């Protein structure tokens, strides 16, 4: 789920950047580093909206790299357990659905897909369908899923979906 | 702490001068911009002393008080004796 929150970060400036235009370089450095990154604590970091305050440079002992704390508001995306969310089915397999929730990859195992659905690799797109084909889940379809599991791997979160209770599945 | 009333001395201490000069000399040695003009000086210490005499060192001294508060003085705000 998308949050807007305030964060703290410290940047070590190579000395070449002292002078006029320095703060703009500081902001651009923050943009370069933190955007696109993902943290198990705050979930994925969508983008840095605004920099509230630039803390005063502190000179470290030796190595002279000046150190700037930056307070900044940014957009992050962090799901939670039991959250129902819109997701997109990017690829299908006999094991289950690999879907994408914005930046996040989410998995729905075969047991978490309801019993009515059988895997048909033979379909022109491999898909999931009932014997009647009434409800057919294939690639690019929009679905609603509960996040029943979240797991952090190398700062990158991927989730586990479930379609059990009512009002879930094809949209 | 009220910056309008700073209780510490308006003079730069010998230790403040020493550390400010060393810090600024290291900054110059690491290719920081110089705030004063230069005739032929290439030693960072000489450049830092020239900047201190000119009152053009971009450093703030954060003097801590025993109670825990602090007072921020610009190097240009202090009285340089030596």
């Amino acid at each position: 789920m998308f949050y807007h929150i305030s964060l703290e970060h410290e940047i070590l400036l190579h000395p070449r950047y002292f002078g006029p235009n320095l703060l703009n370089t500081v902001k651009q450095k923050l943009f370069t580093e933190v955007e696109g990154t993902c943290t198990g604590k705050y979930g994925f970091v969508i983008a840095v909206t605004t920099i509230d305050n630039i803390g005063a440079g502190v000179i470290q002992p030796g190595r002279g790299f000046v150190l700037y704390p930056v307070k900044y508001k940014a957009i992050v995306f962090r799901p939670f357990k039991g959250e129902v969310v819109d997701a997109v089915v990017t690829q299908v397999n006999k094991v289950g659905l690999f879907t994408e929730i914005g930046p996040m990859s989410c998995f729905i195992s075969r047991h978490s897909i309801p019993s009515e659905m059988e895997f048909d690799p033979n379909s022109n797109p491999p898909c999931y369908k009932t014997m009647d084909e009434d409800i057919v889940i294939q690639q690019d379809d929009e679905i609603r899923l509960k996040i029943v599991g979240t797991r952090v791997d190398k700062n990158d979160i991927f989730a586990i979906g479930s379609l059990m209770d009512d009002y879930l599945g094809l949209v | 702490q009220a910056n309008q009333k700073r209780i510490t001395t308006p003079y730069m201490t010998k230790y403040e001068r020493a550390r400010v000069l060393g810090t600024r000399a290291l900054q110059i040695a690491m290719c920081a911009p110089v705030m004063v003009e230069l005739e032929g000086e290439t030693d960072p210490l000489l450049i830092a002393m020239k900047e201190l005499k000119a009152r053009k060192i971009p450093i703030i001294i954060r003097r801590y008080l025993p109670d825990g508060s602090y007072e921020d003085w610009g190097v240009d705000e202090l009285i340089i004796s030596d």
């Binding site: 320095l22 000046v66 | 020493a18 053009k56 450093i59 703030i60 001294i61």
Partner: peptide, 16 residues
């Protein structure tokens, strides 16, 4: 003690 009884901060408004 001595040179360690205080901190130094960079003056962003004066580097201009």
């Amino acid at each position: 003690a001595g040179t360690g009884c205080f901190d130094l901060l960079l003056d962003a408004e004066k580097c201009k």
